[PDB]
Each structure stands twice: as C-alpha cells, then as structure tokens.
Design a protein around this motif. Structure first.
Motif, mmCIF file in Angstrom:
data_model
loop_
_atom_site.group_PDB
_atom_site.id
_atom_site.type_symbol
_atom_site.label_atom_id
_atom_site.label_comp_id
_atom_site.label_asym_id
_atom_site.label_seq_id
_atom_site.Cartn_x
_atom_site.Cartn_y
_atom_site.Cartn_z
ATOM 1 N N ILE A 51 0.851 -1.043 0.051
ATOM 2 C CA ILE A 51 -0.090 -0.163 0.018
ATOM 3 C C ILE A 51 0.893 1.310 0.098
ATOM 4 C CG2 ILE A 51 -1.831 1.285 1.295
ATOM 5 C CD1 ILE A 51 -1.767 -2.253 2.106
ATOM 6 N N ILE A 52 0.342 2.209 -0.791
ATOM 7 C CA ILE A 52 1.303 3.447 -0.788
ATOM 8 C C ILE A 52 0.309 4.711 -0.368
ATOM 9 C CG2 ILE A 52 3.010 2.879 -2.310
ATOM 10 C CD1 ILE A 52 1.655 3.172 -4.747
ATOM 11 N N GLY A 53 1.078 5.608 -0.455
ATOM 12 C CA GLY A 53 0.102 6.997 0.201
ATOM 13 C C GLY A 53 -0.080 7.977 -1.059
ATOM 14 N N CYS A 54 1.192 8.657 -1.379
ATOM 15 C CA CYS A 54 1.347 9.484 -2.383
ATOM 16 C C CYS A 54 2.253 9.158 -3.432
ATOM 17 C CB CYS A 54 1.257 10.983 -1.876
ATOM 18 S SG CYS A 54 -0.296 11.504 -1.486
ATOM 19 N N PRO A 55 2.285 9.542 -4.594
ATOM 20 C CA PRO A 55 3.246 9.395 -5.639
ATOM 21 C C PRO A 55 4.423 10.317 -5.468
ATOM 22 C CG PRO A 55 1.287 10.287 -6.741
ATOM 23 C CD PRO A 55 1.013 10.267 -5.129
ATOM 24 N N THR A 56 5.619 10.198 -6.148
ATOM 25 C CA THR A 56 7.035 10.828 -5.785
ATOM 26 C C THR A 56 6.745 12.103 -6.702
ATOM 27 O OG1 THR A 56 7.655 9.453 -7.372
ATOM 28 C CG2 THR A 56 8.283 8.959 -5.233
ATOM 29 N N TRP A 57 7.491 13.274 -6.410
ATOM 30 C CA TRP A 57 7.758 14.416 -7.363
ATOM 31 C C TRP A 57 8.825 14.201 -8.264
ATOM 32 C CZ3 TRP A 57 3.301 16.538 -7.824
ATOM 33 C CH2 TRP A 57 2.240 16.366 -6.635
ATOM 34 N N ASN A 58 8.735 13.367 -9.274
ATOM 35 C CA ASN A 58 9.879 13.220 -10.217
ATOM 36 C C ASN A 58 9.338 13.247 -11.826
ATOM 37 O OD1 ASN A 58 12.285 13.235 -9.320
ATOM 38 N ND2 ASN A 58 11.913 11.407 -8.020
ATOM 39 N N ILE A 59 9.026 14.379 -12.489
ATOM 40 C CA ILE A 59 8.776 14.571 -13.627
ATOM 41 C C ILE A 59 9.780 14.395 -14.828
ATOM 42 C CG2 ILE A 59 7.437 16.074 -15.450
ATOM 43 C CD1 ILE A 59 6.119 17.531 -12.539
ATOM 44 N N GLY A 60 9.484 14.165 -15.866
ATOM 45 C CA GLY A 60 10.377 13.986 -17.135
ATOM 46 C C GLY A 60 9.610 13.102 -18.083
ATOM 47 N N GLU A 61 10.104 13.632 -19.369
ATOM 48 C CA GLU A 61 9.619 12.742 -20.431
ATOM 49 C C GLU A 61 10.900 12.087 -21.280
ATOM 50 O OE1 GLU A 61 9.072 15.161 -24.146
ATOM 51 O OE2 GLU A 61 9.982 16.842 -23.187
ATOM 52 N N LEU A 62 11.960 12.153 -20.713
ATOM 53 C CA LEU A 62 13.049 11.622 -21.183
ATOM 54 C C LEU A 62 14.390 11.680 -20.344
ATOM 55 C CD1 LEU A 62 12.497 11.002 -24.629
ATOM 56 C CD2 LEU A 62 14.970 11.343 -24.449
ATOM 57 N N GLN A 63 14.967 12.937 -20.118
ATOM 58 C CA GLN A 63 15.913 13.254 -19.213
ATOM 59 C C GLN A 63 15.497 14.088 -17.864
ATOM 60 O OE1 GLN A 63 19.628 14.251 -21.604
ATOM 61 N NE2 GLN A 63 20.331 12.643 -20.312
ATOM 62 N N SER A 64 15.764 13.532 -16.828
ATOM 63 C CA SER A 64 15.200 14.268 -15.521
ATOM 64 C C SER A 64 15.703 13.486 -14.472
ATOM 65 C CB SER A 64 13.813 14.490 -15.786
ATOM 66 O OG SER A 64 13.540 16.155 -15.852
ATOM 67 N N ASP A 65 15.434 12.272 -14.192
ATOM 68 C CA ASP A 65 15.601 11.553 -13.123
ATOM 69 C C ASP A 65 17.177 11.178 -13.383
ATOM 70 O OD1 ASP A 65 13.634 9.754 -11.219
ATOM 71 O OD2 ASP A 65 12.545 10.649 -12.597
ATOM 72 N N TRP A 66 17.976 11.660 -12.187
ATOM 73 C CA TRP A 66 19.319 11.520 -12.206
ATOM 74 C C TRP A 66 19.424 10.358 -11.152
ATOM 75 C CZ3 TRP A 66 19.538 17.168 -10.826
ATOM 76 C CH2 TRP A 66 19.308 18.073 -12.029
ATOM 77 N N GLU A 67 19.346 10.358 -9.924
ATOM 78 C CA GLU A 67 19.251 9.494 -8.991
ATOM 79 C C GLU A 67 18.313 9.547 -7.853
ATOM 80 O OE1 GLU A 67 22.592 8.986 -11.287
ATOM 81 O OE2 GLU A 67 23.653 9.148 -9.675
ATOM 82 N N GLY A 68 18.230 8.877 -6.875
ATOM 83 C CA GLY A 68 17.737 8.976 -5.764
ATOM 84 C C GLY A 68 18.194 8.412 -4.504
ATOM 85 N N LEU A 69 17.639 8.310 -3.318
ATOM 86 C CA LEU A 69 17.970 7.918 -1.979
ATOM 87 C C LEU A 69 16.789 7.161 -1.239
ATOM 88 C CD1 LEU A 69 21.096 8.986 -1.412
ATOM 89 C CD2 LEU A 69 20.264 9.513 0.797
ATOM 90 N N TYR A 70 16.412 5.991 -1.694
ATOM 91 C CA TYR A 70 15.388 5.297 -1.090
ATOM 92 C C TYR A 70 15.323 3.881 -1.697
ATOM 93 C CZ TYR A 70 13.649 8.272 2.667
ATOM 94 O OH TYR A 70 13.122 8.784 3.879
ATOM 95 N N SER A 71 14.704 3.012 -1.288
ATOM 96 C CA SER A 71 14.309 1.684 -1.680
ATOM 97 C C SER A 71 13.134 1.457 -1.342
ATOM 98 C CB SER A 71 15.179 0.574 -1.122
ATOM 99 O OG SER A 71 16.621 0.642 -1.281
ATOM 100 N N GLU A 72 11.906 1.807 -2.333
ATOM 101 C CA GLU A 72 10.624 1.669 -2.021
ATOM 102 C C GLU A 72 10.153 0.830 -3.123
ATOM 103 O OE1 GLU A 72 9.131 3.211 1.196
ATOM 104 O OE2 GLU A 72 7.734 3.927 -0.435
ATOM 105 N N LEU A 73 8.948 0.217 -3.008
ATOM 106 C CA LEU A 73 8.540 -0.758 -3.668
ATOM 107 C C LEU A 73 8.313 -0.270 -5.189
ATOM 108 C CD1 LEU A 73 5.510 -1.308 -5.430
ATOM 109 C CD2 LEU A 73 4.533 -0.344 -2.988
#
Length: 169
Positions: A51-73
């Motif tokens: 079960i989840i609460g709310c989605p993350t805040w990471n937009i992008g249509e190609l290049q945007s997501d660089w890295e993160g710091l967590y291990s979620e489902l």
C-alpha cells in the motif's frame, strides 16, 4: 499466501495507530509495514501486495531523473502485483485511467505490471463480514483541538473494503 504490507516515504499523520485499525480491518493478520526500514525492500519484494500513500515528485519525458536515495516498492521490479494507494483527499492529477495503448509501459510499477487502487466506487455492501480475531473491542471518541473534522467512522472499513475488494474480494 496473503501478506499485504504498507510502505511509504513520508511521516504519518495525526492519528493514533491507524496501522492497528487497518490491521483489524483487513481481518487477518496480514500487516507488513515498512516500519522495519532497517530491513531491505526485499521484504515487500517477497510479497506482491503493498500500500502506498502518495506518488513521488519526479517529472520527465526523457532526461530528468538522475538518482535517488531510497528503496521503495516503486523501485523493486514488481510484476503483476496489487498496490493500494491512500485514495483521495484534495487534489487532481489528470491521467489516462489505464485502458489505453500509447507510450512504453516502462515508467512505474503500477504500469509495470499489476493493478492500482485508490478511488472508492460503492455499489453493494450487503455482505456483513466478521473476521473474528483476538484483538479486542473498545469504542470511544475525543475532541481534537484542530477545527477541521475527520472522515466517517466506517471509513477504515471502506478503504479497507476497497483494498480487499481489488486485492481479492
């Protein structure tokens, strides 16, 4: 077998032990929260229901997501699993329901493989369940300082019914 869990990436709220209510709601004992953050995401990886609460805040249509710091489902390579989201509250995020062919599946777990619940669409509640389980029964109330009010009392039973509904009525 049955083994639903709840994994989030934010604080709780202003409730006592909702985990308890939801726990008593699910009927069974299936209650695996991320509380064991000291463990690995493999915990939920073993189960195909979280079960989840709310989605993350990471937009992008190609290049945007660089890295993160967590291990979620959301990270795990979840495949054809059930994911129950908090539901609604006060927001709007236009997006194709699901039934549609456009773009690459690869994007999120929800779209990766499985089903996602959040909305509530009552229709028939003439079931009357009773998961007799050792816990206890004690009704009560308490005037909270805050002015705002809370949802119904049978809310938990609702949301829960929603999860249990999709999950496997």
């Amino acid at each position: 077998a049955k083994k639903i869990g709840l994994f989030y990436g934010t604080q709780t709220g202003k409730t006592e032990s909702v985990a308890e209510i939801i726990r008593d709601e699910f009927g069974n004992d299936v209650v695996t929260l991320h509380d064991v953050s000291q463990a690995e995401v493999t915990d939920l990886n073993d189960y195909q229901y979280l079960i989840i609460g709310c989605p993350t805040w990471n937009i992008g249509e190609l290049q945007s997501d660089w890295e993160g710091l967590y291990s979620e489902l959301d990270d795990v390579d979840f495949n054809g699993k059930l994911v129950a989201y908090f539901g609604t509250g006060d927001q709007i995020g236009y997006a194709d329901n699901n039934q549609d062919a456009i773009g690459i599946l690869e994007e999120k777990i929800s779209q990766r493989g499985g089903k996602t619940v959040g909305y509530w669409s009552t229709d028939g509640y003439d079931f009357n369940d009773s998961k007799a389980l050792r816990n206890g029964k004690f009704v009560g109330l308490a005037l909270d300082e805050d002015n705002q009010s809370d949802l119904t009392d049978d809310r938990i039973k609702s949301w829960v019914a929603q999860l249990k509904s999709e999950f496997g009525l």
